[model samples]
Target chain A: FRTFPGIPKWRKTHLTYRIVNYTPDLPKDAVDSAVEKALKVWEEVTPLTFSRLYEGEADIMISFAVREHGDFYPFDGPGNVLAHAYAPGPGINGDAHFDDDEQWTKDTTGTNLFLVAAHEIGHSLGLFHSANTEALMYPLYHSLTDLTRFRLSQDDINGIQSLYGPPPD
Target chain B: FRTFPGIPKWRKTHLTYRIVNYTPDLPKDAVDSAVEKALKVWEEVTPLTFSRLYEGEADIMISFAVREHGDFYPFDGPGNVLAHAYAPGPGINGDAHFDDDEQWTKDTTGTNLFLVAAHEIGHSLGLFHSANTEALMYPLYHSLTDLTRFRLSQDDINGIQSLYGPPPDSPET
Candidate 1:
């Protein structure tokens, strides 16, 4: 039986997620595209498969938030932490939250949602911050990054791959 | 009645609105708090109040999206339009949205919630982009606005005041 040091033991075969809110700067379709891209980022490398569900409740709940959010972390107001997500587990686990405070943009002008979301989702999937700054799983924030620009440090790929191995053919 | 020559006109008061889908970057409560703070920024300035309801069948519905969200503005995948709130009107008006594409933080390391909300709220309140970079209504974006050192320019204060005016009991306009 495989076990993660910090993550709670749960059936890992099926993972579910839901987006609770939307950003107005972009159209709804844009939001979907970004998320789909972020999710695919992981699916491409690992055997893990994801499912989207909209119903009474879901295992993972994704949304936007600001200061004094019920959790211990409170938003600093305008420009500080761009976003964060939790590890896989029950209740709050696998939940992702973005600081609705920052001016999120499509290009380098503002914080990049796809990059950050990819990072947070990495954590949601049980991956931790990487030491390599260039890696998507890096702890620090970078203003510019995309599928082409985003290179998973060997460490990140190894970590996730260890959990699920290469994707199914 | 005072009116700006170039400003767009709508039915004097009633406005449509909706909350889109939420991001999964943080917990549910975190999402709620960010939204609350965003709304409060506007509520404090105007006599106007806001109410949130499900997007079910409404002309304006709030839903979570990324990249190309169905409008002219498409999320640049990660950084850019962190979030945007529309003015009060039909179609896409009065909708407050957060970019599910960025990494939102509650600290000084990432974008600040109150500052951006204040700017977006300015839009919701019928204010247009400002030429003054110092004003919250400025068109371009500032990643880190030092609130301690930041103050609303006279132009912004005057503009908002023109629309809502000071609260009734406090001072004479």
Candidate 2:
């Protein structure tokens, strides 16, 4: 479990997130479910809570964009870096953006949205890539099957708990 | 000439600007010259002065992008809203962005970079859309023909001066 240098974490427990737009590769409902499940991965372990926002801005702004979508970091066409996110702060911080150039899917058929988003959400929560290969926070991506019974690795749990602490007794 | 409510202006006189990237439409030097001349429009009337920075963050970060380029405001495809900017402040504030979809040109042939940049710079300097049609700060984009003898209108001068005050007598135009 690793935390980014400077240890940037959300100051509050209850954070809101908004999906500014959706990906064309998957159904709207599939994208929503995968995102919700990804947020749940952290929420189940930490005292942190996540809510969805439909209007204005949120503490976390999620969007799918291709190539140069705005920020200084531009997405490569396909493969390589599938998505990127920012550490917690104001404005552009705490935002997660997926490279729409990749074929995002709900399952293991293509780049799994659940797997990619869960990792990105960790970044949004201020966790750095872990050296542990089993850890979800690891920098590299691998095909993880069986979404119905998926769980966070021990390294992932320790990393998140270090910043946010365990859920209430 | 009007000002944005809350009147967000730069706190300092000597500010810095950077060209984050260049548009594919024109030569890099052409883009550089237009931006320099546009900033001069406000510099001539007020005590404010601008210096160029290439290494680090600048007070005004300038860039060109097509369609959705990161910020909340997405550039519409060509025509209509040629470019946009932010008022003076920290972070993303005081940055100017030009829509790359438009045919940005150095002269009157297409969208004149100098003319549009002059208006956006006014917004960057805290001046809002002026009611006066002749003012450079006017919201509507008009095809202003001449670049060789361009000068700021009275409303433009008055608006900028109101924020930055008149230039000191020692400096040369």
Candidate 3:
């Protein structure tokens, strides 16, 4: 049950990211840490490595924005809609946008940037919302306390590995 | 007070960053942690916000390279010149480079990447060697200071705030 219809994965293992801007609600470095930590989760389970691009268009475009920043998918305020990212593709593919309307916090009290970014980055990596509630890509955002030690659920690993194979043993 | 001549400053408060490359010496995440912590030092005291750039050139370009990767300032062997950074500018301005020759580490054992980055980033943000020994900008490097709960010395704080002003009530990123 992978590759929803014609969904695709990144053609290459080495990918790049660019943060257009950040949210005023959170610390700039906090946003940087959240994004980096979120992306690293996938790297631990896959062969992918994310690098930062200073200029031009990158594979994944990260932005901390509010309602109607750009593109067709306007944010539906905050809290209700934490953030969203594009599937692996060109132009706008693999891009993630966070809603500043919500109080984006580093801790579990507010909309946890790490958890939301992880889910959105999963989408940018070509994984759809999973049916399994235990999965990180399960759509519904749950309060995750220990992002430092989070592991991909078996369902997530199986599904992601199906597309790009498991990490090197 | 704000720095005098030679201590160049960024024109804008909101800056961009790009980690051109990473080091294998430490786990990738630790490197990320070290860099973020390093930049946060300035971000906290000043109104500046450092956003990372991935596709192109950022205000501050952070990279891990070996000897003579680029530019004229090639890194020495293991110990001296652990890392270096640019003042603020266009192409090459506000960039921090780590010497891959040195063993960058997370703890106190090998050369701590966090300490070096904090020093180098101070340079990237318009700071120079400080006559004040208490400052992180001191020309020489030492390990007496703490890493986890780090603070900016008066000299360091005065120099940065003079340029960007104090951080907003809560720092709107």
Candidate 4:
């Protein structure tokens, strides 16, 4: 389990997020469900609570963009980097951007939006790319054999708990 | 001259803006200078005074985006829509987005950043696209013959002055 250099974590337990826009590859409802489930992954372990916002500014602004989408870091065409996110903070921080070049899918056919979003949301909540291959925050993107029965590893639990204490009992 | 459906205008005379990100097409300093000069286009004619912020939220958040950049209106690949901006209000309002797909240059050889920014800032300030071809608020993109000697047309001045009153006389006097 690893953390970013500054160990930047969200100061508040209750955070709100907004799906700023949608990807053309997946249905709107699919993207919404995937994002909701992904955020639930961390909420299940941490004391942090997540809410969705339809409009106005949010703590986390999620969007699908191609190369050169406003931030200092730009996405590669399709492969290589599927997505990236920032640690929790103000302005552009804590936001996640998915590379629209890839064929994002609800299931295992193409790049699974749920898996990538779950990993990216971990970073959004202050966890770094874990060297532990079994962890959900692992650097490389891997498809889970069973999406229906997926859970965070102990390493992931330990890493998040380090920053945010633990979910109430 | 035309206005958005709501004719959304800023209530305050002073506004703040931040260049959220830069485009790779131009030098950093060049983008900064162009944005500064572009904002000055509005500052000179109206009571609106612009201040630049490095971080946090500003009334107008400026950035260069490629396509489908967290907004409803996506930028066309290269040529069609050079840039877009939201009318003044809350949330995404007053934000300007530039399409990085176009070769944005400081001068007229490519899409001039200053000209496009000036036009987009017009929208941010609540002035809508004008039917007058000579106006800076014209819907289409047109290169200025001399970038060094550019000034707003009567239609532009009238439109902006309608939103924000004329600048006050010299303070020293």
Candidate 5:
């Protein structure tokens, strides 16, 4: 995995997030649950903990859109790109974007919201596409071939730990 | 005029690169011609010029990878991403990696090597995804987007100049 120049990492450990909108593909609460789970993927490995806010702004804002959304990184139609997120910063920093055009599901049938969220959150926390194929930070979005549980690769663990220390053992 | 924050760019005006290896996707002369043309896109806009080196490891080391090549960033099976490169720095910095999985031809018949090379070299020059869709720096690669002539959009021209300066004559408006 890679990090942006200057290694732009989050300044704090405990961070708050807000989900501005929900995708039509999944249930509202389900999307909410998925968001929590995705954040947990990072928190489990790093010294980071995430909380949700119902109103106002958040350090990392999550949303879903189809074509040219508010930000510069627009979602491609269906396949080439699943989604993109920004590196940690102040405004619009740490935000995650998903293409509404995709049929997001809870499982491997369609674009798994949880998996993409897990990958993009890596970016949200100052990580980038890893050269390691097993890495969650890897750039290419691979469909989960199995319904098995999620795990972080050694490379992914090393990447996040480098930015933030290892999780409290 | 912007460079990816902290991504180091070339310090000097004259920089050198080497082919390292070539893919069978295109003929040697054709690949050489395309590579030269791609370098020219940045050369024409910025104060920097790229010289080709054959033997030693140049500042930028470019090569083609299929799947699970060395160095972690592997080539995906076929389509999604056409290529990727590093920002300016030492060693493998400014190196460009092309996915040999794609049918790289000279024209619109397949993914045009010239266009993809031009885009990769943009990364080599330290520009990131631009909000402006018209810019060549935009991440998504649409084959016919600007096929008529390989012209760098105003955004592309400005991004490089921001790192380097305006080309000798034009002085960006």
Candidate 6:
């Protein structure tokens, strides 16, 4: 049996996520591409396959906000919390929220949506922050590289593989 | 003199902010546009204005992270706490942070970047959470409206105006 800190054991069979909105800085296709890329990161590591939901009721609902968003945690303004997501659960569970406070960029200049989404998806898949700074699971954010340049460190691979096991051949 | 709940009475002068990189999800233009919109919301409202510095020495630095990104707060991962910012002050003051833990969109479908940024700017302007949910300063996230449809609620106007007065030469309409 495997478990993540602060996250409950998985009792559900399927995982679903919904993108509640899109940023004005990029085209619609960008949103789809980022989300797809995020999900792909997890799919490549485990047997877990994700499904996008459009019914407004999905297991995970991803959206953006600033200060005092429904939850007790309020966004400061533009420089503290870039974005955040919830662990897997009901209602607000598994839902992801981004801080519209910071500027999100496609290149390496600002916060990368795809890279962060991939990291958040890892958490949604029961992965925790890793001590390895080189791993996507690392706590701090780095924009120097694109998704193609990122490869899971040995610890990251071992950790996820330990939980879900190697991808089914 | 009118004041808000949990808001300190001290004045914040010479506020500073920075933009840090995290994920390479969208192009630089996308990020810059969203940030510019967010900043413009504040600049349009108050007598205060902002200037950016690249020395990583600004009063407020915007960065990205997953999980523990320093400070007492740690990211919940994938949903709950999307992002946070700080008030004007020394050191970590005025800095904004985003959780590299979610899929950020550039349109109204995923997350309304302008709406959230507007809310954050409210904080930068010294406004706290309001009891009125209709106010932009309210602490909850709403996605029903597009960027063009978003406006400062009366409560928000009243709060911000009290701090910085009316928008320059505009009459008190």
Give a tens-digit lDDT track for model 5, residues B1-173. Answer: 35677867777788888775555456566777888999988888777888887645687767755544454476675789888898888866788977766777888887888888898888887888888888888877785655866689988887887788777877445
Clashing pairs in 5: A1-A130, A131-B72, A131-B73
lDDT of each: 0.63, 0.83, 0.76, 0.83, 0.77, 0.66
The per-model DockQ list reads 0.14, 0.12, 0.02, 0.04, 0.01, 0.05
Cα RMSD for candidate 3? Answer: 12.9
Candidate 6: lDDT of B140? 82
Q: Write the per-residue lDDT of candidate 3 for residues B40-141, one digit (tens) a residue.
A: 888888888888765545788777654434476776756687888888877777788777667788977778888889889888888777888778888766
Pick by DockQ: 1 or 6, better one: 1
lDDT value, residue A69 of candidate 3: 45
Candidate 4 runs further than 4 Å off? A1-169, B143-145, B170-173
lDDT per residue for candidate 1 within A38-135, as digits (tens), equals 88888888867788975424676776665544466766766768888777788778888887667666656677777778778887888776666666
> Fnat of the models, one by one?
0.32, 0.29, 0.00, 0.03, 0.00, 0.00
Residue B113 error for model 1, in Å? 26
Candidate 2 per-residue lDDT over residues B7-46, each given as its tens digit: 9988898999987665656766788899999988788788
Interface RMSD of 1: 12.9
Q: What would the DockQ be for model 5?
A: 0.01
lDDT of 6 at A147: 62
Rank by DockQ (best first): 1, 2, 6, 4, 3, 5
Clashing pairs in 4: none
Q: Comparing candidate 2 with candidate 6, which one achieves the higher TM-score?
A: 2
Clashing pairs in 2: A69-B70, A70-B69, A70-B70
RMSD of 4: 16.4
**DockQ score of the complex predicted as candidate 4:** 0.04
Pick by lDDT: 4 or 5, better one: 4
Candidate 2 Cα misplacement greater than 4 A, ranges: A1-68, A71-169, B170-173
TM-score of chain A of 1: 0.87
lDDT of 5 by residue, A66-128 (tens): 555565566678777787888999977888877766787887788888888888888899997
Q: What DockQ does predicted model 3 obtain?
A: 0.02
- Ten consecutive residues with minimal summed lDDT in candidate 2 chain A? A141-150
Candidate 6 chain A weakest lDDT stretch, 10 residues: A1-10
Candidate 6 per-residue lDDT, tens place, B9-89, comes to: 226444555565433445556766787778776667666667776444676676655554456677777787777776655
